[PDB]
Amino acid sequence: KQVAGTMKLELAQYREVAAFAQFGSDLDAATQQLLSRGVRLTELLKQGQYSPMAIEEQVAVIYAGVRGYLDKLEPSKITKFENAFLSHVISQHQALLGKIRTDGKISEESDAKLKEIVTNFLAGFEA
Amino acid sequence: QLEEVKQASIKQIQDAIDMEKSQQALVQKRHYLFDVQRNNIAMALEVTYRERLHRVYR
Amino acid sequence: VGLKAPGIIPRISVREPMQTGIKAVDSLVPIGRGQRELIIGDRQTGKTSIAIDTIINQKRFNDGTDEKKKLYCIYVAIGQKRSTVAQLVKRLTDADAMKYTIVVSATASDAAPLQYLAPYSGCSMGE
Amino acid sequence: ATLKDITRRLKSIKNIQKITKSMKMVAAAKYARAERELKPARVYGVGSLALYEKADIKTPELIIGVSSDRGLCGAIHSSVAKQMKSEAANLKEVKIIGVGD
Amino acid sequence: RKLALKTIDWVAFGEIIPRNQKAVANSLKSWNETLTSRLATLPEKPPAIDWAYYKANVAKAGLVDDFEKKFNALKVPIPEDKYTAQVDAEEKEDVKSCAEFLTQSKTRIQEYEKELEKMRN
Amino acid sequence: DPAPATTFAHLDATTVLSRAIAELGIYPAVDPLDSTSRIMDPNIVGSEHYDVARGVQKILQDYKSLQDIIAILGMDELSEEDKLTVSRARKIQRFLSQPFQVAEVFTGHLGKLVPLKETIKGFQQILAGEYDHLPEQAFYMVGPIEEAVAKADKLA
């Protein structure tokens, strides 16, 4: 809920601005953002065929995107990022993930841990 | 008068910063590298034995 | 096979969640269990795939302890030729989700009443 | 209704589709050119402003629309139209020259 | 499995490439990540065959049993080093790095700081 | 009309043989965007086809996207990369023109066959731009991509 509420919504709007805004239109920053981000989110739900997942990963990566950790990144590389990220967190932050699974509910600390994990990971993803 | 006093207070911390920064980096980075090097090798060894056991068993 | 759908009182609403490992799904059309949800879709768009990954996903659960959530999967295959099925089944085999799985198969060929019947059948088994 | 109605529809739309396109590419050709040919002009006209730039001259006393002679293949005219009536409020002497019909 | 972090490394690596290898490291980083994700995935060892079912119920057991013995006796080596005096040229490069830069630079900084005293004024 | 609709199930790899291609004088006259397979999917067959093709199909279509642009503008205006890609697309295209053994009567040629790896490799080459300094029309009516290459050479 915590990621999705926003996301579903974001996608709705995103979709809406996918749908009205820019494609050969306007260039309001808000919406342009929504698109960038959105576009991002789109990939992020885009899932290979033969690719089912654990929920926590999903909330995690989704969270990442929700929280805008990738507007600063171009769409293709998200995918790369995710895989890598995923295996990373699986490896180390299986702890954190474990927990996240456990409580079933991301927690602020975790958010930070995650954030960090991602940001840094991300940081790694670039550099 | 006043120009030179400021000029030099600038130049001196500038040369202090860069020299101490150049030292500080190398220690940890190369410590950095040292380890990646032992990693890079190590990796494949594990893989390869593990893989052997599957391969023959098939 | 002809057992009635029980009453309200013989039923209860959902609070169950169910997962598919498909981010989009579990999130965006988040589905519990009981639920009738139409998958509507076209020529191996993964149309079929979609079910497969979902099933696969349940593997962890069938590897898990969510018995209370243990999802016995019934894929009643109507009209999918023997080959189609062959691929599919095979995939399932590989995933050996099959251990928690019925695949009722009335292929493309079939005598129509069989095809007709098959779901009711699947249904009974699942009931 | 019926397919009739529909085709009756279709017919035209298709026609349109073409027409629009005829009109389109042709326009685009002209356009393409028009732009292209615009290069020395661009400079030149940019040139024109040379010192009007470096000092504009004030007239407490020359509105002049410039549009093409047709439109409604856009609201092209409407923009100037706007901008000229809007102008006209502001102004002095309003005698106007319309290049463009 | 095979690797590890030492210091701070996969991130802290890539950015920083001693000129005498500098160019190489950029390419090497990406190679490494390929190896990393690959190794982590593979199986580590398979099963080890249920003989009981196969020996009894593959009744060409003269063949099977002989092949069995050869398999059960079958010994296995390990892979090969090739590239790990780099590991040791490390301690050498580590001298170069500290003392060879550490020392000369510490004496340099010595002068910069002593000159700081007067130029407070 | 249901039947083909059903047929789609019964179709698994699809051939629309195409006049356009034919019109381009290209025998093979097939359209790629139709020469598809429901089993042609990357996860479901493979992206070597699917993407090398996607790159290709991209390139041609993208080129088609340019073809309208170019259709107005000529070539000049484009980025060179596009120009390249056009040429390549075109080489690739030409490389699809494949002589016929069974129609020396039409072709005045023997036919050809192309071994798939070599074909693909071929496209990797063109894709790689490798031959794009070569006669594009040497890609015309050949068998192996090598023979397109060969065919380029004798010219230049």
Swiss-Prot record, chain C:
It is found in: Mitochondrion inner membrane; Cell membrane. Acetylated on lysine residues. BLOC1S1 is required for acetylation. Heart muscle (at protein level). Heart and liver. Mg(2+) binds at T48. The modification N6-succinyllysine is found at K59, K68, K90. The modification Phosphoserine is found at S13. The modification N6-acetyllysine is found at K59, K68, K69, K90. Homotrimer. Component of the ATP synthase complex composed at least of ATP5F1A/subunit alpha, ATP5F1B/subunit beta, ATP5MC1/subunit c (homooctomer), MT-ATP6/subunit a, MT-ATP8/subunit 8, ATP5ME/subunit e, ATP5MF/subunit f, ATP5MG/subunit g, ATP5MK/subunit k, ATP5MJ/subunit j, ATP5F1C/subunit gamma, ATP5F1D/subunit delta, ATP5F1E/subunit epsilon, ATP5PF/subunit F6, ATP5PB/subunit b, ATP5PD/subunit d, ATP5PO/subunit OSCP. Belongs to the ATPase alpha/beta chains family. The siderophore enterobactin (Ent) produced by enteric bacteria binds Fe(3+) and helps bacteria scavenge iron ions from the environment. As a consequence, the mammalian siderocalin LCN2 plays an important role in defense against bacterial infections by sequestering iron bound to microbial siderophores. LCN2 can also bind iron bound to endogenous or nutrient-derived iron chelators and plays an important role in cellular iron homeostasis. This is ATP synthase F(1) complex subunit alpha, mitochondrial. The chain holds residues 172 to 298 of 553 of the full protein.
From Swiss-Prot, chain D:
The modification N6-acetyllysine is found at K14, K30, K85. The modification N6-succinyllysine is found at K24, K85. It is found in: Mitochondrion inner membrane. Belongs to the ATPase gamma chain family. Component of the ATP synthase complex composed at least of ATP5F1A/subunit alpha, ATP5F1B/subunit beta, ATP5MC1/subunit c (homooctomer), MT-ATP6/subunit a, MT-ATP8/subunit 8, ATP5ME/subunit e, ATP5MF/subunit f, ATP5MG/subunit g, ATP5MK/subunit k, ATP5MJ/subunit j, ATP5F1C/subunit gamma, ATP5F1D/subunit delta, ATP5F1E/subunit epsilon, ATP5PF/subunit F6, ATP5PB/subunit b, ATP5PD/subunit d, ATP5PO/subunit OSCP. Subunit gamma, of the mitochondrial membrane ATP synthase complex (F(1)F(0) ATP synthase or Complex V) that produces ATP from ADP in the presence of a proton gradient across the membrane which is generated by electron transport complexes of the respiratory chain. ATP synthase complex consist of a soluble F(1) head domain - the catalytic core - and a membrane F(1) domain - the membrane proton channel. These two domains are linked by a central stalk rotating inside the F(1) region and a stationary peripheral stalk. This is ATP synthase F(1) complex subunit gamma, mitochondrial. The lineage of its organism: Eukaryota, Metazoa, Chordata, Craniata, Vertebrata. The gene is ATP5F1C.
Swiss-Prot record, chain E:
The keyword Isomerase does not apply. Its main location: mitochondrion. It is found in: Mitochondrion; Mitochondrion inner membrane. One of its GO terms (biological process) is proton motive force-driven mitochondrial ATP synthesis. The keyword Transport applies. The modification N6-succinyllysine is found at K75, K82, K92. Keywords: Acetylation, CF(0), Hydrogen ion transport, Ion transport, Membrane, Mitochondrion, Mitochondrion inner membrane, Transport. The modification N6-acetyllysine is found at K29, K45, K60, K69, K75, K82, K92, K114. Transmembrane segments: none annotated. GO terms for molecular function: proton-transporting ATP synthase activity, rotational mechanism. Signal peptide: none annotated. One of its GO terms (cellular component) is mitochondrial inner membrane. Belongs to the ATPase d subunit family. This is ATP synthase peripheral stalk subunit d, mitochondrial. It comes from Bos taurus. The chain holds residues 4 to 124 of 161 of the full protein.
Swiss-Prot record, chain F:
One of its GO terms (cellular component) is mitochondrion. One of its GO terms (biological process) is proton motive force-driven ATP synthesis. The modification N6-succinyllysine is found at K154. The keyword S-adenosyl-L-methionine does not apply. The modification N6-acetyllysine is found at K58, K112, K117, K154. The modification Phosphoserine is found at S47, S65. One of its GO terms (molecular function) is proton-transporting ATP synthase activity, rotational mechanism. It is found in: Mitochondrion inner membrane. Transmembrane segments: none annotated. Keywords: Acetylation, ATP synthesis, ATP-binding, CF(1), Glycoprotein, Hydrogen ion transport, Ion transport, Magnesium, Membrane, Metal-binding, Mitochondrion, Mitochondrion inner membrane, Nucleotide-binding, Phosphoprotein, Transit peptide, Translocase, Transport. The keyword Glycoprotein applies. Catalytic subunit beta, of the mitochondrial membrane ATP synthase complex (F(1)F(0) ATP synthase or Complex V) that produces ATP from ADP in the presence of a proton gradient across the membrane which is generated by electron transport complexes of the respiratory chain. ATP synthase complex consist of a soluble F(1) head domain - the catalytic core - and a membrane F(1) domain - the membrane proton channel. These two domains are linked by a central stalk rotating inside the F(1) region and a stationary peripheral stalk. Belongs to the ATPase alpha/beta chains family. This is ATP synthase F(1) complex catalytic subunit beta, mitochondrial. The gene is ATP5F1B. The chain holds residues 369 to 524 of 528 of the full protein.
